[PDB]
Amino acid sequence: GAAAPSESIPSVNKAWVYSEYGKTSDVLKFDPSVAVPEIKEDQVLIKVVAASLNPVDFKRALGYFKDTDSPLPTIPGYDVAGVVVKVGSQVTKFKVGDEVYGDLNETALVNPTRFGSLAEYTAADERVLAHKPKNLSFIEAASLPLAIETAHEGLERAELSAGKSVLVLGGAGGVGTHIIQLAKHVFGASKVAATASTKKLDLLRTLGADLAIDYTKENFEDLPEKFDVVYDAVGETDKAVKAVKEGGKVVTIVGPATPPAILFVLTSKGSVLEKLKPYLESGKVKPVLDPTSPYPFTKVVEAFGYLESSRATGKVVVYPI
DSSP, rough: OOOOOOGGOSSEEEEEEBSSOOHHHHHHHEEEEOOOOOOOOTTEEEEEEEEEEOOOHHHHHHHTTGGGGGOBBBBOSEEEEEEEEOOOOOSSSTTTTTTEEEEEBBBHHHHHHHSSSSEEEEEEEEEEEEOHHHHHHHHHHHSSSHHHHHHHHHHHHHHHHHTTTEEEETTTHHHHHHHHHHHHHHSSSSSSEEEEGGGGGGHHHHTTTTEEEEEETOOOGGSOOOEEEEEEESSHHHHHHSSSEEEEEEEEEESOTTOOOOEOBBBOOOHOOOOHHHHHTTTOOHHHHHHHHHHGGGGGHHHHHHHHOOOSSSSOOOOOO
């Protein structure tokens, strides 16, 4: 990892861009010659190999957090995996040639970068990145950060620990899939319960759920069993609070939260991915990709449309970029 030759890094590249807020089918345009971002001294420049989509990407593009967004135009995409091509002068953890992955935006809703992952090259803070596990493809790696870190942070906020029970609302979703795997394999839960629709229950069990509850047939909050931790990933805290043991904790990522539930927004941290590395390397915790992934870089509008349709059953990843 000595520096790349200077003129080997381009100053323009291909990216997807929107210049006004709206629906992705209306505003998202391919630009063959966008500026490659200059890095700050605590950043690296990455040759992007794969990027994954998230709901935040299209909600941001609709203007949902314009108050605290970065200036338009925007190149979307939070999740990335790729190869380091340049390091800033304060970077100590990465060298040129390192294969890396992460969620670009430390504070998801406050000044996310103008230059996201749906581009050939992007700038990333050292602190958001981790070394890619050798046994994961770039597609697989790209699929992970936002969802696995959100699962981890919520479980830590809820104080999950060995021997405790957990109920996950929305187990088949992108975050919920990892809540289940982390609860069972990383946090040592004695019992993991989760809700989903009828066709998704075998997925819940495959991932680690001891009890898969069909929300189309029964109401979890009416069960006599109550849980040490309830992690709401759908926006049902008014019911979630009825399923927790006295003295337990309820956390949600979809507000407004009914007290005593709390809402949080992920802080993206490469350190979390590093802490999870051995579970990813042993396959105890697995990526969950949509069968339609990957989408080629030419097909980013279609990728968004599929994510937005709610028909996705796993992560929507864009590759090759």
